């Protein structure tokens, strides 16, 4: 009584696939034929930020686009500045293998975690002037991939136990548990309306989850390899991600089909950093070839290379208003573009 | 006005930069390892050398994604605990050696058990009889050299796998522990010193 269930599941999957094929009677390529290309774009480093010691895997931009936080393997959490070069705060991290960091929308809270099963949360506003430790969460059975802040009191963390989480400061443990993934979650992003968020796994699958309902609604199986980075459009009705097979696919929430393909034969390096722009016209994607590439969202043509990084680019940061683009890498150098 | 910025932040930046130098000089002295194979961190000092062990067992046995973080470590300690099972260890060693991120990290090999405790080989290997022992140092007891043939064969296989893709970038240091059950850290320190010396030679293009 197991083969019949698998056969029924395969038949249902084939039916959904042919329904998607019949529904997708037109492609986006024939619609964007009349759009003038953006042309070549020149990128330069306004300033170079230095002072770190080890590799940087994730960084979060500020709400006001003035202060940014970066996590390094040396155990130090350094908050940098965008208008100037001088640093502001240096938070000594207890964990020596941190892989992610988060910045609160109000700016009063920061988060960190990775390879320690503990998501330490610190506060930046205090009377003494020195940062303290708010609380430590020990309800995970896997390495933390990335942490995000829904609100000033809500935090969502993805761990290595192939399950998501929803922690609360006052409650102390997870309010609800998300189950159904078949692979380890590597990254997640939040839509501007803070209602819909996706989480990519190693099974080439992207799932849509509800913070209130707690049940999955959308499942995408249009990829071929594991997903490393993911981000949302500023509109929030669509999102794109880059897998290890050197290609990007722009998924749609309303349309259950792949819209655009950004595969290039000249490059085979994987993609570990995916972010959008203010208007979403430019799709900045990281690469392992010691450079970053910019792809148009309507013509799938390269319009600028952010070369100049000593090591592999691991994290990418774009401000909410699209004022500047910050690129990180395994070296202890930080560059701000424009 | 707005002169408070370059009257407060100017020294606020550099009052923590002095502590950053101390953090750099204490982090550079420490040596980072990785106990992969067979409670979370161990700190010890041997011959005024800061050693910062990294042994992890909390997560699942899926090191496909999180093994890329161990790139700045000096060396990786490998435990075989042979005392099937050896095939998985060989596959893990091949994946570590062929990894592009781990190609610059040397691996320290321990060809014995790790619990410090005081025999079918021909069935799991098609060629066992057509093997000759190396001209290395004989064991001090010198009793029953037949059992040493299997460990010599697996050491030779590990050396061949290491030298298949070990062209100068990283090297292998096989060892046979549990003979004295006391000198288990001195060999690791010597291997780390040799790795650092070879890396310094590579920076000077003298090797």
């Amino acid at each position: 009584e197991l083969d019949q269930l698998r056969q029924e599941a395969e038949q249902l999957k084939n039916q959904i696939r042919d329904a998607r094929k019949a529904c997708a009677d037109a492609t986006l390529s024939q619609i964007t034929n009349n759009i003038d290309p953006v042309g070549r774009i020149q990128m330069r480093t306004r300033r170079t930020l230095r002072g770190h010691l080890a590799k940087i895997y994730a960084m979060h931009w500020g709400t006001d686009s003035r202060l940014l936080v970066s996590a390094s393997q040396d155990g130090k959490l350094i908050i940098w500045d965008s208008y100037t070069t001088n640093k502001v705060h240096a938070i000594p991290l207890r964990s020596s293998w941190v892989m992610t960091c988060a910045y609160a929308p109000s700016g009063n809270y920061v988060a960190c975690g990775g390879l320690d099963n503990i998501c330490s949360i610190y506060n930046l506003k205090t009377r003494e002037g020195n940062v303290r430790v708010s609380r430590e969460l020990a309800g995970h059975t896997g390495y933390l991939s990335c942490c995000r802040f829904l609100d000033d009191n809500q935090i969502v963390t993805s761990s290595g136990d192939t399950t998501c989480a929803l922690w609360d400061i006052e409650t102390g443990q997870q309010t609800t548990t998300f189950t159904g993934h078949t692979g380890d979650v590597m990254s997640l992003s939040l839509a501007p309306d803070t209602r819909l968020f996706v989480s990519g796994a190693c099974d080439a699958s992207a799932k849509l989850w509800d913070v209130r309902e707690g049940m999955c609604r959308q499942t995408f199986t249009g990829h071929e390899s594991d997903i490393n980075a993911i981000c949302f459009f500023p509109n929030g009705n669509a999102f794109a991600t880059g897998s290890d097979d050197a290609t990007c696919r722009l998924f749609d929430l309303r349309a259950d089909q792949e819209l655009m393909t950004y595969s290039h034969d000249n490059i085979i390096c994987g993609i570990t950093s995916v972010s959008f722009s203010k208007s979403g016209r430019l799709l900045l994607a990281g690469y392992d070839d010691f450079n970053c590439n910019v792809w148009d969202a309507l013509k799938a043509d390269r319009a600028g290379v952010l070369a100049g990084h000593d090591n592999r680019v691991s994290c990418l940061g774009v401000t909410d208003d699209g004022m500047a683009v910050a690129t990180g890498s395994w070296d202890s150098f930080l560059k701000i573009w424009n | 006005d707005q002169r408070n910025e370059e009257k407060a932040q100017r020294e606020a930046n550099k009052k923590i930069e002095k502590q950053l130098q101390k953090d750099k000089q204490v982090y550079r002295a420490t040596h980072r390892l990785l106990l992969l194979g067979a409670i979370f961190e161990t700190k010890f000092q041997v011959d005024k050398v800061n050693f910062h062990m990294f042994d992890v067992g909390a997560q699942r046995d899926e090191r496909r994604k999180w093994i890329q973080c161990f790139n700045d470590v000096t060396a990786i300690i490998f435990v075989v605990a042979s005392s099937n099972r050896l095939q998985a260890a060989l596959k893990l060693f091949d994946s570590i050696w062929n990894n592009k991120w781990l190609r610059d990290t040397s691996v320290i090999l321990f060809l014995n058990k790790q619990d410090l405790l005081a025999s079918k080989i021909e069935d799991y290997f098609p060629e066992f009889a057509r093997y000759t022992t190396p001209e290395d140092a004989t064991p001090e007891p010198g009793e029953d050299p037949r059992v040493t043939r299997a460990k010599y064969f697996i050491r030779d296989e590990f050396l061949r796998i290491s030298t298949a893709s070990g062209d100068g970038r990283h090297y292998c240091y096989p060892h046979f522990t549990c003979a004295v059950d006391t000198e288990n850290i001195r060999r690791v320190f010597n291997d780390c010193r040799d790795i650092i010396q070879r890396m310094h030679l590579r920076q000077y293009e003298l090797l």
Partner: nanobody
Amino acid sequence: QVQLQESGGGLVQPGGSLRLSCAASGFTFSNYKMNWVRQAPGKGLEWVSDISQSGASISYTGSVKGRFTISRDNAKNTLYLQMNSLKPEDTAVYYCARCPAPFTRDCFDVTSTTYAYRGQGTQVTV
């Protein structure tokens, strides 16, 4: 998505030299390495053999060396495993494993945990 379906199992007499093949769909066959993983009943998963993209890096374990032959073709997008010299203790279930790293051999298929790129498995017995 990735599809890995295989057929040709069942119970056969020893020495029959029957052919077992697995079909790969949904991904490029040449760009991704293919591995063979078997799981004995009551024992953990064991790696069988692997074939590189070019077809020169072919290796076998200590129990299936010489007797096992693997062939790769690009037109049919299928992988073949020639199993011979049947023995009663060789019974297991075989998965047409797939390495998810293109142009690089840094992947794990020997672990006992489930994999995101492994087949359902078919029972093989003498």
